[PDB]
Amino acid sequence: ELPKPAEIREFLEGYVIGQDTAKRTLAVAVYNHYKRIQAGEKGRCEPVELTKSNILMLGPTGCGKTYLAQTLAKMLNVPFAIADATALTEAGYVGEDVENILLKLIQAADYDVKRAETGIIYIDQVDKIARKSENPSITRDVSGEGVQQALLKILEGTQASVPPQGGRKHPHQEFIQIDTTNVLFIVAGAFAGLEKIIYERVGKRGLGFGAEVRSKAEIDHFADVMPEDLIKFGLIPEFIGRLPVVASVTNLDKESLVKILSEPKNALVKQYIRLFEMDGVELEFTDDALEAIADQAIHRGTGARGLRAIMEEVLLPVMYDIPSRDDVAKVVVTKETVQDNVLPTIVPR
Amino acid sequence: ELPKPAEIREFLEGYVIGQDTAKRTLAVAVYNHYKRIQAGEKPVELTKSNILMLGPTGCGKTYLAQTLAKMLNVPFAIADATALTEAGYVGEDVENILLKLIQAADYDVKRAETGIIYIDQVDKIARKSENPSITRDVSGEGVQQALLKILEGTQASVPPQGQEFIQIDTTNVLFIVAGAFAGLEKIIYERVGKRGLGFGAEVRSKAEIDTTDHFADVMPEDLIKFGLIPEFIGRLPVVASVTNLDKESLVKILSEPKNALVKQYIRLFEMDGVELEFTDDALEAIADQAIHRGTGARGLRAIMEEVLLPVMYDIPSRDDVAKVVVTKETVQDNVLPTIVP
Amino acid sequence: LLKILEGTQASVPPQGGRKHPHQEFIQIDTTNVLFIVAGAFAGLEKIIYE
Amino acid sequence: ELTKSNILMLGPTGCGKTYLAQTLAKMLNVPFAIADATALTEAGYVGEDVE
Amino acid sequence: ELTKSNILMLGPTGCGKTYLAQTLAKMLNVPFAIADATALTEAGYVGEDVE
Amino acid sequence: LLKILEGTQASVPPQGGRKHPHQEFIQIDTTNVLFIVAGAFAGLEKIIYE
Amino acid sequence: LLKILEGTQASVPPQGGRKHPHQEFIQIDTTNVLFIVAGAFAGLEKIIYE
Amino acid sequence: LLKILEGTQASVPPQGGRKHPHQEFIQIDTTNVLFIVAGAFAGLEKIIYE
Amino acid sequence: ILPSFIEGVKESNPYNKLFEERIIFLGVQVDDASANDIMAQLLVLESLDPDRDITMYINSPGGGFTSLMAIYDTMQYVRADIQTVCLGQAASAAAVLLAAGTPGKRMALPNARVLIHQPSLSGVIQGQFSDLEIQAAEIERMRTLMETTLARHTGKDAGVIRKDTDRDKILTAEEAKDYGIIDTVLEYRKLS
Amino acid sequence: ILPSFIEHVKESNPYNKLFEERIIFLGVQVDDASANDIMAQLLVLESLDPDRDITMYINSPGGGFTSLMAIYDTMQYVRADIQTVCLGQAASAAAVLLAAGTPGKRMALPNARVLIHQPSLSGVIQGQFSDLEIQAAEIERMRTLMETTLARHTGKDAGVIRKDTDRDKILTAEEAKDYGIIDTVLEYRKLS
Numbered sequence A: 001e002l003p004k005p006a007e008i009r010e011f012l013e014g015y016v017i018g019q020d021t022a023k024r025t026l027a028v029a030v031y032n033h034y035k036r037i038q039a040g041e042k043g044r045c046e047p048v049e050l051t052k053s054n055i056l057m058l059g060p061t062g063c064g065k066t067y068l069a070q071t072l073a074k075m076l077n078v079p080f081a082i083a084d085a086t087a088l089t090e091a092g093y094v095g096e097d098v099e100n101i102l103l104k105l106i107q108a109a110d111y112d113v114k115r116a117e118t119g120i121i122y123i124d125q126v127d128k129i130a131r132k133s134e135n136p137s138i139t140r141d142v143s144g145e146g147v148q149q150a151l152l153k154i155l156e157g158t159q160a161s162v163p164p165q166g167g168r169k170h171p172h173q174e175f176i177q178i179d180t181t182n183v184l185f186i187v188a189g190a191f192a193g194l195e196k197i198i199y200e201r202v203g204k205r206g207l208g209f210g211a212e213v214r215s216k217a218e219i220d221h222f223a224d225v226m227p228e229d230l231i232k233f234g235l236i237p238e239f240i241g242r243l244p245v246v247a248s249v250t251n252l253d254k255e256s257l258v259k260i261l262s263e264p265k266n267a268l269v270k271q272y273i274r275l276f277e278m279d280g281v282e283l284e285f286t287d288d289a290l291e292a293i294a295d296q297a298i299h300r301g302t303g304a305r306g307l308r309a310i311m312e313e314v315l316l317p318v319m320y321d322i323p324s325r326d327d328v329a330k331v332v333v334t335k336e337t338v339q340d341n342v343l344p345t346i347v348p349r
Numbered sequence B: 001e002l003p004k005p006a007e008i009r010e011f012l013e014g015y016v017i018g019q020d021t022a023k024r025t026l027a028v029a030v031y032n033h034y035k036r037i038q039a040g041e042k043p044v045e046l047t048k049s050n051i052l053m054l055g056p057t058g059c060g061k062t063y064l065a066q067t068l069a070k071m072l073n074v075p076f077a078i079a080d081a082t083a084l085t086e087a088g089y090v091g092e093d094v095e096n097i098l099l100k101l102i103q104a105a106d107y108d109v110k111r112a113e114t115g116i117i118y119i120d121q122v123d124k125i126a127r128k129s130e131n132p133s134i135t136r137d138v139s140g141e142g143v144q145q146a147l148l149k150i151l152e153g154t155q156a157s158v159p160p161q162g163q164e165f166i167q168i169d170t171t172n173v174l175f176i177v178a179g180a181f182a183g184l185e186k187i188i189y190e191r192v193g194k195r196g197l198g199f200g201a202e203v204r205s206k207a208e209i210d211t212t213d214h215f216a217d218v219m220p221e222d223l224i225k226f227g228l229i230p231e232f233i234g235r236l237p238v239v240a241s242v243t244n245l246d247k248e249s250l251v252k253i254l255s256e257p258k259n260a261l262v263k264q265y266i267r268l269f270e271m272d273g274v275e276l277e278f279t280d281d282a283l284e285a286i287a288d289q290a291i292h293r294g295t296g297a298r299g300l301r302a303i304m305e306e307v308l309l310p311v312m313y314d315i316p317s318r319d320d321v322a323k324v325v326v327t328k329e330t331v332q333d334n335v336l337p338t339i340v341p
Numbered sequence C, F, G, H: 001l002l003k004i005l006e007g008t009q010a011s012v013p014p015q016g017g018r019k020h021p022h023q024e025f026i027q028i029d030t031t032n033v034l035f036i037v038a039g040a041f042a043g044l045e046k047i048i049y050e
Numbered sequence D, E: 001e002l003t004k005s006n007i008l009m010l011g012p013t014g015c016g017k018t019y020l021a022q023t024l025a026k027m028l029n030v031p032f033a034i035a036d037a038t039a040l041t042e043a044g045y046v047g048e049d050v051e
Numbered sequence I: 001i002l003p004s005f006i007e008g009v010k011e012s013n014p015y016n017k018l019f020e021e022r023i024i025f026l027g028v029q030v031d032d033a034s035a036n037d038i039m040a041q042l043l044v045l046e047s048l049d050p051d052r053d054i055t056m057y058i059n060s061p062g063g064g065f066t067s068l069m070a071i072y073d074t075m076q077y078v079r080a081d082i083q084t085v086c087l088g089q090a091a092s093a094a095a096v097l098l099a100a101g102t103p104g105k106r107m108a109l110p111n112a113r114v115l116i117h118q119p120s121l122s123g124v125i126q127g128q129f130s131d132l133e134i135q136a137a138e139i140e141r142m143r144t145l146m147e148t149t150l151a152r153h154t155g156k157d158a159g160v161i162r163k164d165t166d167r168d169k170i171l172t173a174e175e176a177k178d179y180g181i182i183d184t185v186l187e188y189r190k191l192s
Numbered sequence J: 001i002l003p004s005f006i007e008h009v010k011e012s013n014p015y016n017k018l019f020e021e022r023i024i025f026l027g028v029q030v031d032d033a034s035a036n037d038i039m040a041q042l043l044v045l046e047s048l049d050p051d052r053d054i055t056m057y058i059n060s061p062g063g064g065f066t067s068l069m070a071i072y073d074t075m076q077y078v079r080a081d082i083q084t085v086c087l088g089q090a091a092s093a094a095a096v097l098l099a100a101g102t103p104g105k106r107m108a109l110p111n112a113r114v115l116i117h118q119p120s121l122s123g124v125i126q127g128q129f130s131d132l133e134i135q136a137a138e139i140e141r142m143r144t145l146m147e148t149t150l151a152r153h154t155g156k157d158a159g160v161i162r163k164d165t166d167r168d169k170i171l172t173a174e175e176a177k178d179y180g181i182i183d184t185v186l187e188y189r190k191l192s
Ligand SMILES: Nc1ncnc2c1ncn2[C@@H]1O[C@H](COP(=O)(O)OP(=O)(O)OP(=O)(O)O)[C@@H](O)[C@H]1O
Pocket: A015, A016, A017, A018, A019, A059, A060, A061, A062, A063, A064, A065, A066, A067, A068, A124, A125, A189, A190, A260, A264, A303, A304, A305, C006
C-alpha cells in the first residue's frame, strides 16, 4: 500500500547523494505520516490517536536540506508546501503571517482543505527565527522569537483560521478553517553557530591540552544534539519540544561531493555539459579532475553549492573563449583545477 | 451542575500524569468559580480566582486545559495569545477570545457568561522594550491592557466571523492563562537563590537547575520583571505551579494514558504487522533521558523517535513477529532485537 | 535574501515595495533570475591577507 | 535543468562595479533591476523589504 | 494661585501604603489610579507610558 | 515623571489603538491631581542612621 | 538639536507615533522659535575656576 | 546616502502624490540631483595636520 | 615576560584566557600562597559551573605538605572533575596533585617527568627531644598520609608507595602511566 | 625602557603587538615562570587559530630542563606550526627550542649564536650516594632525552649530538643551518 521507507529513500537517493541519516529520517517520518493518515480514517483496533512527530533538520549550508525537501516534494502523494521562516512575522506586523505558510499548503492541494489537513509544510531556514541570546530578548523580535511563539500553536496542532489573503482585510472571504494536528512540519536550518554551542555543553573546551581545537581541515559537529543546545542557540524551549525528530544533515565529505558532480538527475557536471552543448562543444571531465573539484570544494566550505563555485572559476576562461571558436571536445584535466589558470585540452574539427 | 474538586482532579488524573499540585490548584479554583456563580444565582464580594498556569514546557499546561475541556460541559475557549494584537491593527483582536467562547457555547450567550476562556502563551504578550524598527509594538502591553477590562469583567462587543455585535459579560467567566515563562526561572533564582560559592555552599549543578523554582517562590515582582504589567497579575490571584516532571511520572506518561506514547508506536508497528514491546527497564531508560532535555513529555517523543529510527526504516521491508526494545537501546547504541518467524 | 537568491515562489507586493500582509500579490519565481551582487568590502583585504 | 550561478562582485571604491552593471543594463535583452542592499530591511521591520 | 502638595510614602512593603490611599480616595469618592514606576523603562521611551 | 507631578496640560490617547490615526486625544491637567507616590525603601535607614 | 536651534523645516511625528516611514508628519519651521536651553552645569564651576 | 549621491531610481516611502492608499511611492532619478553636503569636521584639522 | 592586553575593563593576559577556559595553573612551587591561589580558583570555577571539568596544569616543583593537602582537598571537594595535566615536571607534592585528578582525566606531556619522594623537613627543626618526637611523628604522619593518598589514586598498596618513594623516584610520562599517577600521555596534536 | 601605544581604550606594549601577530617571545632564561608564560601563550594562540602558525622568538641563554621540556612538548603539542627565530642567542634549552620548530620554519638572524651543551647542575646537589646515583641517573636521563630531542630535529644521530654537546658547541647561524638546528639564516630585508 504505502511507500516503504526503503522505497522513499531510494527515490531520495536518485537526487540526494550523501546524507544517509537524514534520508532514513524523512523516509521514516514520511512513512509514519502516511500511516497517520491511514490510521486517521480507519482503525480491538486500538483506539489511539497519533501525534505528528515533527522534524528539525540541522546541518551546514549547501548540504541537502532544501534539496532533500524539494526531492521529497517530487514523490509525496500528499500536499507539500515549502515555506520560508525568513518571511514570517508575528501577527500584527508587516510581513507574512505564520498562517500564510498554511495557506501555501491549502494552495498546494489546489484549494482543498481536507487534503491540506493531511499535508507537509517545510519551513526553511528556522535558524533565522532564532534569537541572539539564550535569554528573552530585550527587543520584541517580531521576525524571530515571535515567529517561534506564533508557530507553536500550528506545530502542535490547532484549529487555525487561515486568512484567504485576496481581499482588503481579513474576514472578506471567510477564513479557511484547517486542522494542523496531522500536518507534518519539517523545519530546517543551517544553525551555523550551533556547533560552538554543542562543544560548550559537553565539557569540551576550545583551549589547552586535551581540549579539541578545530582546524579548517575539519571543514561531534551536529550529532549529540540536545534541545538545550538549541535553547542556547536562540530557539525558545516551547518551539523545540514540538520538534521531536532531528534529521541530522552532515557536512558532505570529498567522496560525496565527487558523486554530487556526476551522479544525480540534475547533476552539476551534467549542467555544464548541457551548457557547452549549446555551443556545439562536448565537455569531458577526467575523473581525476572531478576529485580535484571536490577537493577544493571542502576548502570552499559552502557544501555542494561550493562545487558550483569551483567549476565556474575553472571553466571561466573556457566559457569565455569557446563560444568564439570551433571545437568538439573540451577535456577538463586535473591540471586546471588544483593548478588554477591552466588552459585545458582542446579537440577541434 | 457542579463537580467536586476531588472529582475534577480524578478526571485530570485519567489523562494528566504528575503535576499533582497544579491539579489541586486547578480543581479547587474551577470549583471555587462555579460555586461562587451558583451561590450568586441563588456575599463578602469574593475574589475572581483567575488561574495563571506556568511551568516548564511539555509538562502539561495545555494538556491540563484540554482535560478540563473534556470534563465540565461548560463552554471552554482554547484561545491563544500568540495572535492577539491591539484593536485597529492587523491580526486577531482581543475580543476574538470571547468569540472563541461562544463558538464553543454554540452561540448561547448565557452559558458563555459562565464559561472558561483559556488563554495560551501569555508570556508572548509580556512587555518587551520596544525595538526601534517595528512601528508601535502592538503585541505586548496593549494586548495586556485590553485584557484588563474583561479579566475583571465588563460588557464587551464581539465582532463575528473569526453583523450585530454580541454582548458578553465576563464577570462570571473564568480565565485560565498559561505560558512557559522561560526567562522567569532565572529571575526567581536572582531573588530566592544564590550562586553559591565555596566550601559547604550549595552550588546547584545543572541537573538541579532543571528543577522548578515556580513552586512557592514565584511573586508578582518576578512577573513584572518578565514583562507582565502589575494589574494583569492582580486579575490572576490564583497561580497554578506547573512543575517539571520527575522520572516516575515520565514512565507513566509512556504507557498509561489514552493516547500514550508506546501505544502510539505499537499502533505504528502493528500496521506493519509487527509487535512492539518494551521492557520496564527500557521505559525507565527512555524517561530519564527526557529530564536532560527539559522539554517535558514532548521530549519523550524525541527519544523514542531517535531510539526507534533504525527499526522504522528496517521493519516494514521485512517479515517479523516482534521486537523487544531493551535498556541497551537508549543507554547504549541500538541493538536490532527483532524476532523473525 | 537567500530565499530570493536560490529561487523561491516569492509573493511581491504591487503596493510599491512596502510589505503589508493583506493584498493580492505578484507571484514571481526566482529560480532563473540571476543575482549579480556587489559591494566595496572595504575591510576584507585585511581578512584575506591573514 | 540549469541553475542560477549568481555573482558576488568584489572591488574597491570607484573602480567600476555599478558602472559594470549600468553598462550591462544597456545591452541586456533581459529585464534588469539595480537594487541596493542598504535600502532593504528584514521582513517585519520598517524600510523596504527584500521583495 | 495656590499650589498642590504631593505625598511621598516611605518605608518597606506590605505595610498598607496603597490601602491608605485607596481608602482615602473611597472616602471623598475621587478617582484613584494605581501605577508603578517599573511600568517606565530605564532605556528611554518614557513619555508615552506616563500618559 | 515630575512633569505630571508638577502639573501639565497632557494629551492622553484614549487607548493603544488611538496612536494610529492621531487626531483625537483626551486633555487633562494635573495641576489639581493629587500624587501619592510610594517606594520600597529597605536600604534607606543606613542614610537615616548616618 | 543644531538645525532645530537655528531653524529648519522639521518634520514632527504626532503624539504616540515615531519617525517611522508611512507616518504623517507636521512640517514646522523652527527659524523664529526661540530656544531657552538651560541646565545646572555643575562641573562648569571647576572649569571656570580653571 | 551613497546610492542617492551617485544616482538611483529611488522611491520616497511616505507621501507619493498627496497620499493615495495605492502607490504611496513616486520615482525620482537622483543622477542629476546635485548634492552639496557640509559640516564642521572639527577633529579633521588635527588629522590633516598629521 | 607576558603580554597583557591592559584595558576600566578586564586586563586579559594569557592566564586569564586560561582561567576563563577553566584551566587552573599550578606552575610555581606549592607554598601557602600558591595553594591559597589554587583553592580560590577551584572554588570560583566550581561556582561558575560545577559540571564542566576544571583543568589543572602542573609545572610545579612541589612544596609544603599542608599546602599540598590544601589543594588536594579542594580538588577532591569541588563538584567539577579535575583534569590534571603535567607540564614538564610534577615533583614532590605536585606529583600527588597530578595523581589527584579525576580517573581518566590525568594527563601528562610526553617529556614531562613525575618525581615522587617522601616528605622532608625544610632545614633543621631544633628543639627538645619531646619536641622532636612530636615533629617526627608528624612527618611520619605526613609520609603515611602521602602514601595513602597516592595509594587511593595510583591504585597501589601504600607499602608499595613507601618502598618507591623511599628515594626520589623520577617517572617519565609513560612510567607515570604504568605507575598510576597519570592516565594518558598526551599525543602531539600538530598538523605537520 | 619599554614604551606603549594606545589602541582602540587598550594600552599595548610592543610585546602585545608581537603576541597579537602570533609571535611568542622567549627572551629570558628558560625557568619555570618563563616556561609557564610560553606554554600559556602557545595554548592561547592555538585556540585563536590552530592553523595560523605561531612564531617563537628566541633570545635566551637557556635554562632548566623540565622548563625546557614543558615548552618543548607544548610547541610539539599545538596544532599550529612553530616558526622559531633565533635573535642574538639560543643557548642550551633555547637552542633545543630553536631546533624544536617546524621543519622549514626554523630561522636565525645572521649574527645569532646557537650554543648547545649537555645538561648541568647549578651548584652542588648534596646527599647520600643512593640519592646521588639517582640524581646522576636523572642527569643522564636529561642528557639522553636532550640528545634524542636534538636527534629528532637536527636529523642527526643522537650519538653525534652526544659527541658535539660534550663541550659548548657554539654555532653561528650558518653553522646551525648546516648542523640542522635552523633551516634558514634569515637574510636582511633592508630597502636600502
Ligand atoms: N546530497 C546532495 N546530493 C546532490 N546534490 C546536493 C546535495 N546536497 C546539496 N546539493 C546541491 O546543492 C544545492 C543547494 O542545496 P540546498 O538548496 O538544499 O541548500 P542548503 O544547504 O539547504 O542551504 P541552507 O542550509 O542554507 O538552507 C542544490 O542545488 C543541490 O543540487
